[PDB]
Amino acid sequence: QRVRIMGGTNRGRAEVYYNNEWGTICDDDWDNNDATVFCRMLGYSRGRALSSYGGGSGNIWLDNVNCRGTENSLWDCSKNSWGNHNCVHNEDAGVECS
Ligand SMILES: [Mg+2]
Ligand SMILES: [Mg+2]
């Protein structure tokens, strides 16, 4: 269950490792609860959702992520099935963690 931030230091595009590849997360309904779960996987306390951070390539793995904000992992969150999306990479979600 691997995640990474690509862009800056405490902010960047939210990427997830699945199906043997680092892929991106479409921003449809991506909010602070989702960003918070994601940031907490990387040792931050909380996150703000960045809509259309953009700039990723390859597979878009997730869309319509619906975390309560309390999960220990993104994998425990309600979300579309893996690789099910109607997105482009301009719409890649990001996070600003603290
Ligand atoms: Mg959209
Ligand atoms: Mg959501």
Curated annotation (Swiss-Prot):
The disulfide bridges present are C26-C87, C39-C97, C67-C77
**Tissue specificity annotation:** Expressed in subpopulations of macrophages in the spleen and the medullary cord of lymph nodes (at protein level).
SRCR domain location is 3-98
* PTMs per UniProt: N-glycosylated.
Instruction: Enumerate the subcellular locations listed in this protein's record, separating them with semicolons.
Output: Cell membrane
Subunit annotation = Homotrimer; disulfide-linked. Trimers may assemble in larger oligomers thus resulting in the creation of a large surface capable of interacting with very large ligands.
What does the UniProt function comment say about this protein?
Pattern recognition receptor (PRR) which binds Gram-positive and Gram-negative bacteria. Also plays a role in binding of unopsonized particles by alveolar macrophages. Binds to the secretoglobin SCGB3A2.
Report what the protein is called.
Macrophage receptor MARCO
Which section of the whole protein is represented?
421 to 518 of 518
